[PDB]
Amino acid sequence: PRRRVAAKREVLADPKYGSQILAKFMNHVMESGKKAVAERIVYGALDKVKERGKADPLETFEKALDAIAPLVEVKSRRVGGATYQVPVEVRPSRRNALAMRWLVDFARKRGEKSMALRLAGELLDAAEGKGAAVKKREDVHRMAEANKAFSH
Amino acid sequence: PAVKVKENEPFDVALRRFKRSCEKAGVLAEVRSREFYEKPTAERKRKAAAAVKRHAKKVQRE
Amino acid sequence: KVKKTVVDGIAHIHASFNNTIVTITDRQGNALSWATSGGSGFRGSRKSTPFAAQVAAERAGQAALEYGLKNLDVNVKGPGPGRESAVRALNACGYKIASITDVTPIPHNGCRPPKKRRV
RNA sequence: GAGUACGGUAGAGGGUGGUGGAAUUUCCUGUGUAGCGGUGAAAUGCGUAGAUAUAGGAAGGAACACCAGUGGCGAAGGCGACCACCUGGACUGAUACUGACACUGAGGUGCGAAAGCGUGGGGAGCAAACAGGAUUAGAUACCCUGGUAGUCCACGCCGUAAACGAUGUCGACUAGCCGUUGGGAUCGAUCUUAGUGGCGCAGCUAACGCGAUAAGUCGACCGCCUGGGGAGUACGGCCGCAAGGUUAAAACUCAAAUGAAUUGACGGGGGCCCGCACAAGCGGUGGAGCAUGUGGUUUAAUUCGAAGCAACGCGAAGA
Ligand SMILES: [Mg+2]
Ligand SMILES: [Mg+2]
Ligand SMILES: [Mg+2]
Ligand SMILES: [Mg+2]
Ligand SMILES: [Mg+2]
Ligand SMILES: [Mg+2]
Ligand SMILES: [Mg+2]
Ligand SMILES: [Mg+2]
Ligand SMILES: [Mg+2]
Ligand SMILES: [Mg+2]
Ligand SMILES: [Mg+2]
Ligand SMILES: [Mg+2]
Ligand SMILES: [Mg+2]
Ligand SMILES: [Mg+2]
Ligand SMILES: [Mg+2]
Ligand SMILES: [Mg+2]
Ligand SMILES: [Mg+2]
Ligand SMILES: [Mg+2]
Ligand SMILES: [Mg+2]
Ligand SMILES: [Mg+2]
Ligand SMILES: [Mg+2]
Ligand SMILES: [Mg+2]
Ligand SMILES: [Mg+2]
Ligand SMILES: [Mg+2]
Ligand SMILES: [Mg+2]
Ligand SMILES: [Mg+2]
Ligand SMILES: [Mg+2]
């Protein structure tokens, strides 16, 4: 806004993992106020993650999150005849939000049985750089570095 | 307009010194002037306006 | 394909409002390597930026390391961007810049220039 | 008052020749390899028949960076490289000299930007006309790549410009302050003289504004105006090689056309500020089926009203 008066809220209460980031992830997967359904979905996905193998499910979670947050972002700007696209570094807070939004949106459209299974598959595949989200990140990165001329 | 690198200084003062020397010489101004043709009416008008502004600038000091 | 060594080159930066051309020669004006902003693959509005000039100078310098050329003198000419980023690319290529000179041609009266654009 | 003789100053004042340095273009040669040029984005165009770049050389033409300045000179138009020659005027100081020899000026005579015209040269750049590429609904334009008359020189004609300070020439008086150009005197300062600028008291003006460079106070002479169109046009005359110039009406038509300033509104003018106005996000409508209001069509009747935002689940919280 113009006034620059927005103040950020503090509601962050991970119940049984005590991990600050998973509460925000569950807020992202929540639809229409149904906290419990999203709660169950995320916990089921993490159970699948912990039973596929020996990796700590939470640790796999932040490893995927690190391997999916973009470093630079492209911003459009019309210069009087053409709309160019400058690169700019992404703020530390925006990285995780973009990562979660992309991860959830791409897990939405996979096509397995239940949403928890979709999320688990996305976390397993993106934990090494093979998911749709990771290639979207690569597309954004190459698009940003192909416009390095403006940058500043 | 020319410079030299003398007695082992970084290539960050020599370049800036060269820029200052070129600005003092008046290279970009000369090129921008000969970029297109300015008819004598426009030249005389510009000189008159600049003189008026210079005189106002001098007078307003007191 | 035959070899020839040469030391103490001269690099000419030719900067216009649309492009930049970097040419490394010997003392006698014999060009060894050259590069351009358009040749680097920019091709348009991106061609008139100091980044394109820096990349062009990098390519030209890397080409010129073949012959040796431990030392370069510099001749800048033109009003456009890429005027200074080319030089600071050239040193980072590894050469020892002895001096920089501006050789922009200035008429004293000369021919009359084109008419003014009505934009 | 107006002129003459004598030293002395400053100046892109004018004419005739000679010569310089920077840069562009073309041409010859060496190196060198895939682009160059241009644009808001492109494309036309130029390149592997070796371009652009870079170095050496040659030819030619035109304009004269810095100095450069509310600076200078000239009746005006106008005049910027350097040197020699021919030549006009202005400013300045002392002494002497003539003795009203003056001012203005209808006819008349002469100079007069640029474009244009005639004859003969020249040809670098720029560029009407013209060609192609874009843009566009179209684009005989703006924009891009080319490009001929012309721009340059000699002689001759043309005789017009927002040829403007939109202010005729000459002379005399009327508070001041601050710069600057050429030059004298007095002790850096003061005085004085001919220019060139910024403010400003009286006074003047419809107002804006002028204000010793008057648009103030006066005198001498000249040119011109008499509502807006038609029209600076037609016809006649005179000039011109032509383009055209100059002098210059009427019928008819209207009741206005106009100048300066004031309040608002508007601007693809400027500066500050704001609002789910953008930006960053979440959920939708437009597709399907149904409910409901409206338009249109139909009917004996489909009862009246609401119509951009600010009408259409609205009057109607019940056909
Ligand atoms: Mg041009
Ligand atoms: Mg060449
Ligand atoms: Mg007369
Ligand atoms: Mg002429
Ligand atoms: Mg002619
Ligand atoms: Mg003709
Ligand atoms: Mg001829
Ligand atoms: Mg041309
Ligand atoms: Mg002629
Ligand atoms: Mg007239
Ligand atoms: Mg005039
Ligand atoms: Mg008049
Ligand atoms: Mg008068
Ligand atoms: Mg008088
Ligand atoms: Mg005044
Ligand atoms: Mg009056
Ligand atoms: Mg009349
Ligand atoms: Mg006539
Ligand atoms: Mg006429
Ligand atoms: Mg006649
Ligand atoms: Mg003729
Ligand atoms: Mg008015
Ligand atoms: Mg938005
Ligand atoms: Mg529909
Ligand atoms: Mg529908
Ligand atoms: Mg009704
Ligand atoms: Mg409603």
From Swiss-Prot, chain A:
GO terms for molecular function: mRNA binding; rRNA binding; structural constituent of ribosome; tRNA binding. The keyword Ribosomal protein applies. Belongs to the universal ribosomal protein uS7 family. The gene is rpsG. One of its GO terms (cellular component) is cytosolic small ribosomal subunit. Keywords: Ribonucleoprotein, Ribosomal protein, RNA-binding, rRNA-binding, tRNA-binding. It holds the Pfam family Ribosomal_S7. It comes from the Bacteria. One of its GO terms (biological process) is ribosomal small subunit assembly. Part of the 30S ribosomal subunit. Contacts proteins S9 and S11. One of the primary rRNA binding proteins, it binds directly to 16S rRNA where it nucleates assembly of the head domain of the 30S subunit. Is located at the subunit interface close to the decoding center, probably blocks exit of the E-site tRNA. This is Small ribosomal subunit protein uS7.
Swiss-Prot record, chain B:
Pfam families: Ribosomal_S21. The keyword Ribosomal protein applies. Residues 47-62 are annotated as: Disordered. GO terms for biological process: translation. GO terms for cellular component: ribonucleoprotein complex; ribosome. InterPro entries: Ribosomal_bS21, Ribosomal_bS21_CS, Ribosomal_bS21_sf. Keywords: Ribonucleoprotein, Ribosomal protein. The keyword Amino-acid biosynthesis does not apply. Residues 47-58 have a biased composition (Basic residues). PROSITE patterns: RIBOSOMAL_S21. Signal peptide: none annotated. GO terms for molecular function: structural constituent of ribosome. Belongs to the bacterial ribosomal protein bS21 family. HAMAP family: Ribosomal_bS21. NCBIfam families: S21p. PANTHER family: MITOCHONDRIAL 28S RIBOSOMAL PROTEIN S21, SMALL RIBOSOMAL SUBUNIT PROTEIN BS21. This is Small ribosomal subunit protein bS21. The lineage of its organism: Bacteria, Pseudomonadati, Pseudomonadota, Gammaproteobacteria, Pseudomonadales.
Curated annotation (Swiss-Prot), chain C:
Pfam families: Ribosomal_S11. SUPFAM superfamilies: Translational machinery components. Disulfide bonds: none annotated. GO terms for molecular function: rRNA binding; structural constituent of ribosome. GO terms for cellular component: cytosolic small ribosomal subunit. GO terms for biological process: translation. Keywords: Ribonucleoprotein, Ribosomal protein, RNA-binding, rRNA-binding. The keyword rRNA-binding applies. The keyword rRNA-binding applies. InterPro entries: Ribosomal_uS11, Ribosomal_uS11_bac-type, Ribosomal_uS11_CS, Ribosomal_uS11_sf. Part of the 30S ribosomal subunit. Interacts with proteins S7 and S18. Binds to IF-3. Belongs to the universal ribosomal protein uS11 family. NCBIfam families: PRK05309.1, uS11_bact. Located on the platform of the 30S subunit, it bridges several disparate RNA helices of the 16S rRNA. Forms part of the Shine-Dalgarno cleft in the 70S ribosome. This is Small ribosomal subunit protein uS11. It comes from Pseudomonas aeruginosa (strain ATCC 15692 / DSM 22644 / CIP 104116 / JCM 14847 / LMG 12228 / 1C / PRS 101 / PAO1). The lineage of its organism: Bacteria, Pseudomonadati, Pseudomonadota, Gammaproteobacteria, Pseudomonadales.
